[PDB]
Structure formats: structure tokens, C-alpha cells
Amino acid sequence: AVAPVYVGGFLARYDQSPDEAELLLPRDVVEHWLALPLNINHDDTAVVGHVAAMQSVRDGLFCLGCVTSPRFLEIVRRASEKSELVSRGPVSPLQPDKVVEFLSGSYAGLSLSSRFKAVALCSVGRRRGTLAVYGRDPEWVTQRFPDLTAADRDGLRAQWQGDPFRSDSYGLLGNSVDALYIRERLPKLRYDKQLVGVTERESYVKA
Amino acid sequence: DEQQSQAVAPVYVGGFLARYDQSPDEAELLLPRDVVEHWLVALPLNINHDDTAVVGHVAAMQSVRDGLFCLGCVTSPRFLEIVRRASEKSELVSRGPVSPLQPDKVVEFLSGSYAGLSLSSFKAVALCSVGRRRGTLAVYGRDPEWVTQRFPDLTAADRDGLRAQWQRSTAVDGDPFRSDSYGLLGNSVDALYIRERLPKLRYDKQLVGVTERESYVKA
């Protein structure tokens, strides 16, 4: 469980038009700019790992991150054991993985904060199509996305191939109540799941 | 530290455990007035039906015109301290309650997290994210009278009945809470996937008229 956990997904979809103008992120700007810390919902006292790769592809900006913080993984491990959702396990093929499943359930989205400053794991991203996919092997995670080509993965593989977490369970729990009041949280996540062709039938995605 | 102390003071919670005017689709959730009044020592108060998460006790239970109403008291020092620490790391709580009300981090976190009531078969009363029976909105407050007053359906007669009960030292209490922050965190992801959580909660609030009053309810 405490072993590293990889997370991948789109930080932005070019064909997607943001609601707020501030979330506009065109291809040329992204390509022009192309390690970023990985934190929990933009709280820089909650860094859990780092972005291990970023690739601008046909449909958007894809990234792969690695959750390495032992403190964070341990807190997650303990919490996962007290989750009814986690206890239900994944769908038929995949084998149970409490930590990966808790992470899939709690932080189902990605959020690129451009103050690029950091990638935050959050309950749902503010940009659509930013579903977060967790797994123990980065190849497997990248393979969860149909839009990526072999050439796309080669570029990503080339990249990914003191505990920074200064928060606690209390902080994560305080974050959880905020998550319950995010409007259209599940519909957004399902929309994202649809847009990137990821199913619960071949991943740990809970939405 | 002084305010920190107030935060961990007792929290009362009130609301209907069942609405006689609501017909549930599932038979296991049926709870008729005659059955309630017949069955009608303090019941334990727990978090989402977890025996290892008892946070207090029920201080009053009353069958009134519109359903079964109950009042409970959250007393566990450990649970309250956990909640206090988490409440300070919540954007929702930072925004505060509707104007006139005094901010109360602990009361607000409880109002946001465990907005529903769920009566288990009487064995216990559980604070949950949303109850399976409709109209089971949970209302938190520092004083029993105030909480009871948030419900327009209760008459002066109804309150006098409840009051007599809570003014009356339970067997539930040292600290009965045998869980921790990790336990509550684990449970919080479960709540994120309950279907139509917010709509149900808004329907509940309007059904019991808590909308017509001002409270710490976040839904």
C-alpha cells in the first residue's frame, strides 16, 4: 500500500470551452511552455509527490504524476480501511487496492494551478475532462486513455522512466466536507469520464 | 485556547427520524405512527451506524403530528476535538453561517458533514451524510431550545414535551467514542458517492421548514 502510486490524466482539453475566462488554456501557450509538485487541492502544505511527465497531445495536455509521501500514503492507508466504498472493491477483473481506491474515490480530478505552478489532486477539477486515474504501474495508467497514441506514450515514458507532506488527517477531513458541497460534482466527473473514454469497467475510477 | 474550549462544548442535534407524511419506496423503511407510539435508557448517538463511533446520546424522542422527532447531544471530547481540528481546514466553514448567526466552526462542520439523521431498528440514532428516510434533516446548535425552535411544525405543546425529557446522566457516557480521524476520513469518501445527496437534503430542508428559519444548515 505504501508503495508509490501513479496518477494520470488530462490537465486540460483543448476542444473544451471553460466557463470562466481565467481557465482558458490554448495549445500554443501550453506547447510554448513545454518538477512540478503534486499537492492536495492546492494546499501547498499538502505536497504528496511530483509530476513525472507532461505531454501536449492531440486532445489536450496530459500528465503523469507520482504520489510518494510516506506520511500521506500512511494516512490514506488507515482511512481506506474505514471506507465502505473501498471495502466493496473494484470491478471483476482488477484486484483490490485499498489505497489506490481511496485516492480514486476522494481525489477523482486534476487541477493545474498557473499562478505552471503545481498539479493538485482534487475531488473534481474546474476544467472538464480532467479525470484522475490512479494505478501502481505508470504504463497501465497511461493505457487507460484511448486518445493517447503509441507515440504519445513513448514521449511520456521517456519522462517518468524529506517528506514534503506538511498536513494531516484533520486537514484532509476538513477538505472532505468542502467536497460534499461542490455543485454537480458527480455529473461533472461522469462527463469527464465520458470525454476521455475511461470506464469503471477497466479502472479504479469510482465515479 | 478559550475559544478552542468553547468549540468543544456540547453540541445538540435535533430533527425528525421519520415523517408520517412520507411514503418510502422501500418497505424496510416503513415506520407508522402506531408502531412508533407503541414502542415509545437513552439511546446512543453514533456516526453512520458504526458501533465504534458513538459520540453522545439521544436526550429526547417525541411522536408529534408530522412524525417522530428526536433531540440528541454530542458529548465525546475526542470526537469534538477531531471535528474542531478539521473545521479549521474547511473552506466551507471559513465562509461562515448566514449573517446574524455567530460563526461556530464545530457546529458548522457537523452541519455540513452529517446533515442527516438515521434511526436504526429502537437501537440507536446515527448522524450521517444524508438519511435514507426523507425529511430527516439534522439540525445542530449549542442549545436544545434553539434547535427545537428551528422547526415550524413543532407546537409549544410539542416542545414542552421534548423539554421535559432533556432537562431530565446517561449510561452511554467516560468518552464512548472508540474511533479516530482516520475513521471519519475513511467514511467521508463513502458520502461523496451517495446519489442525489444534495437534492435529497434540499428536499428535506423544505419539507420540515428549516428553510423558513435561520440555522447552520449548509444544504
Swiss-Prot record, chain A:
From-to range in the entire protein, with total length: 10 to 256 of 708
Disulphide-bridged cysteine pairs: none
Catalytic residues, chain numbering: 42, 111, 118
Organism encoding this protein: Human cytomegalovirus (strain AD169)
Protein name listed in UniProt: Assemblin
Compartments in which it is found: Host nucleus
Catalytic activity: Cleaves -Ala-|-Ser- and -Ala-|-Ala- bonds in the scaffold protein
Gene it is expressed from: UL80
Purpose: Protease that plays an essential role in virion assembly within the nucleus. Catalyzes the cleavage of the assembly protein after formation of the spherical procapsid. By that cleavage, the capsid matures and gains its icosahedral shape. The cleavage sites seem to include -Ala-Ser-, -Ala-Ala-, as well as Ala-Thr bonds. Assemblin and cleavages products are evicted from the capsid before or during DNA packaging.
Self-association and partners: Exists in a monomer-dimer equilibrium with the dimer being the active species.
Endpoints of the signal sequence: none
